């Protein structure tokens, strides 16, 4: 996609307020709760028997920090998401075998989490900017699949 | 299917919307139009400017339909019968857009109900909107 | 949502397929893997090259479930119950993928039914596969 | 998008055999039969009440010719699909108010019609090549929406 200058600024401003580790565990937890089939990758992660357990699971939080950590970092290169994520792309395809649809589901769970976290600050135009970003990151992550 | 837990969670969460139903519907629509511009192709006849009477009005119609749905969650195909007919035979909105409005409805609820939007409730609401969407598209072909 | 005309059409088409159902199943998967590479993510334990016996074997199973569904086209959720469990809880195939294979099954049938694959039969087959897809994903959450 | 050299060659080869008028009418007709909500854009086209009526409708046939003509023309420009269809994209959004999801549906129906018409010759590799093409035309046609 293509963000207007104003849109990039809005994404950046909001993200400076984000506790990446907290939001990462929340988003990945929420994905495993809302779309349980996403748990398929985590048979070794421990207890996922309940929402609380999934949200409370330290391995989920642990991976959460890393996934949103890489997301956070990529926001520095909104102008080259393709390139920024090409190598995680190859990895997720060649070794992790993660259906790219998982990236879209996570992207939308993240938007809900930002909305829940920031409330009214997360205005319709701010969301519209972030939808471009999550679609952009998801696209970028799926681009090296083959 | 909507479990009993889903039904309790949705009634709880939407009950909280109460008299904001209109406002939230309108906001969900505005979020959709801005986030997903292709959806505006179904409303070429609307003033889609922020705060338009038309959007605020259609927002209330959508929310009230949802309140209806929640009220008769155990019997949604019947409760939404006229509306599913309307979408199937007249409006003919491609089914993919239901997921777009549904997502904007979730975002809206999340932004307004910090206390009520838990992971389990988020899940129930998502299933609920998906189920409403299914009813609304059930007669398309 | 399958009308008597749809059921008749499905039975006619799948009848013509007859003993080829298995071969067509494998062909549909091959079509899916080449047209929609992301689907290969669910088969890191298969050799996916053309002619692969694993794909042939999986194709036969897929085809057989469809034959079984056709035979129970009035009572599908139960006929496909074990498959719903398997997909929902073990395989955990993202639901978007069912549309891709359904499309590929359609293309495969089109390529093998010059006489039978009329617009009306095309419509019915598409609905039938959507229905099968719905049943297969109904237990996901 | 991004067809391999051999995918380009497969598309070109098959398309040499396509009766664009015949196929365009067949594909547009099947769109309206298989996804009847798509008839919402064709209120003036006359009789669409039954499948035989949709398929035999001269206005559906006529438009089919134009639509697949434009598709055919774009096959000469597989590297520049966005630029090729920018004008028609603006048309479909600003004047015709056509949900770009319709482009994806038509693309898939066109694939079914090619398979139906050509049988075994529409091999899985040739299908893959056409799938990239239709996804690309649909994307090109959606690009100027706003
Ligand atoms: C913005 C979206 C995502 C980003 C930026 C991302 C990025 C990453 C990163 C940085 C790693 C660590 C790799 C390493 O240490 O070499 C990783 C691993 C992994 N990811 Fe992703 N990911 C995303 C989405 C997802 C989703 C939605 C799923 C599944 C539902 C997933 C499944 C996995 C799995 C199973 C691993 C391996 C974890 C481990 O080995 O401990 N990813 N990802
Ligand atoms: C949960 C999903 C939805 C619900 C509950 C819903 C409900 C309603 C209701 C109650 C009406 C007015 C009925 C009447 O006045 O007789 C309506 C009309 C309409 N809806 Fe749907 N709807 C939904 C999804 C959608 C979507 C996704 C779209 C397009 C993106 C859409 C497009 C329209 C349009 C264009 C009208 C006519 C508006 C007018 O001319 O006033 N709807 N809907
Ligand atoms: C009409 C749609 C489908 C039908 C009827 C179907 C049916 C089946 C059947 C009968 C089996 C064998 C289960 C057994 O061992 O008894 C199976 C397994 C499996 N399916 Fe599905 N399936 C469908 C769609 C899909 C899709 C879309 C995907 C992924 C894109 C998928 C992925 C798998 C995988 C990975 C296995 C296990 C294969 C193995 O390890 O042998 N299926 N399915
Ligand atoms: C490959 C995809 C498509 C291409 C290349 C295409 C191209 C065209 C062309 C060349 C025209 C004629 C313009 C003229 O002669 O001035 C047209 C008109 C039109 N198209 Fe598309 N089209 C496509 C898909 C669709 C789809 C899927 C729909 C709806 C389901 C659609 C709806 C319309 C409508 C309503 C018109 C105006 C018809 C009239 O004159 O009354 N198009 N398009």
From Swiss-Prot, chains A, D:
The modification N-pyruvate 2-iminyl-valine is found at residue 1. (2R)-2,3-bisphosphoglycerate binds at residues 1-2, 82, 143. Changing residue 35 to F: In Philly; O(2) affinity up; unstable. Changing residue 24 to D: In Moscva; O(2) affinity down; unstable. Changing residue 131 to E: In Camden/Tokuchi/Motown. Changing residue 103 to L: In Heathrow; O(2) affinity up. Changing residue 115 to D: In B-THAL; Hradec Kralove; unstable. It holds the Pfam family Globin. Changing residue 117 to R: In P-Galveston. Changing residue 94 to G: In Chandigarh. One of its GO terms (cellular component) is cytosol. Changing residue 102 to Y: In St Mande; O(2) affinity down. Changing residue 81 to R: In Baylor; unstable. Changing residue 5 to R: In Warwickshire. GO terms for biological process: blood vessel diameter maintenance; carbon dioxide transport; cellular oxidant detoxification; hydrogen peroxide catabolic process; inflammatory response; nitric oxide transport; oxygen transport; platelet aggregation. Changing residue 89 to R: In Vanderbilt; O(2) affinity up. One molecule of 2,3-bisphosphoglycerate can bind to two beta chains per hemoglobin tetramer. Belongs to the globin family. This is Hemoglobin subunit beta.
From Swiss-Prot, chains B, C:
The gene is HBA1. The modification N6-succinyllysine is found at residues 7, 11, 16, 40. Heme b binds at residue 87. Changing residue 115 to D: In J-Tongariki. Changing residue 86 to R: In Moabit; unstable. Changing residue 90 to M: In Handa; O(2) affinity up. Red blood cells. This is Hemoglobin subunit alpha. Changing residue 103 to R: In Contaldo; unstable. Changing residue 102 to R: In Manitoba; slightly unstable. Changing residue 31 to K: Causes alpha-thalassemia. The lineage of its organism: Eukaryota, Metazoa, Chordata, Craniata, Vertebrata. Changing residue 14 to R: In Evanston; O(2) affinity up. Changing residue 21 to P: In Fontainebleau. Changing residue 85 to Y: In Atago; O(2) affinity up. Changing residue 12 to D: In J-Paris 1/J-Aljezur. It comes from Homo sapiens (Human). It is linked to Heinz body anemias: Form of non-spherocytic hemolytic anemia of Dacie type 1. After splenectomy, which has little benefit, basophilic inclusions called Heinz bodies are demonstrable in the erythrocytes. Before splenectomy, diffuse or punctate basophilia may be evident. Most of these cases are probably instances of hemoglobinopathy. The hemoglobin demonstrates heat lability. Heinz bodies are observed also with the Ivemark syndrome (asplenia with cardiovascular anomalies) and with glutathione peroxidase deficiency. Residues 1-141 form the Globin domain. GO terms for biological process: carbon dioxide transport; cellular oxidant detoxification; hydrogen peroxide catabolic process; inflammatory response; nitric oxide transport; oxygen transport; response to hydrogen peroxide. The modification Phosphothreonine is found at residues 8, 108, 134, 137. Changing residue 72 to R: In Daneskgah-Teheran. It comes from the Eukaryota. Changing residue 84 to R: In Etobicoke; O(2) affinity up. Changing residue 87 to R: In Iwata; unstable. Changing residue 141 to C: In Nunobiki; O(2) affinity up. SUPFAM superfamilies: Globin-like. Changing residue 125 to R: In Plasencia; family with moderate microcytosis and hypochromia. The initiator Met is not cleaved in variant Thionville and is acetylated.
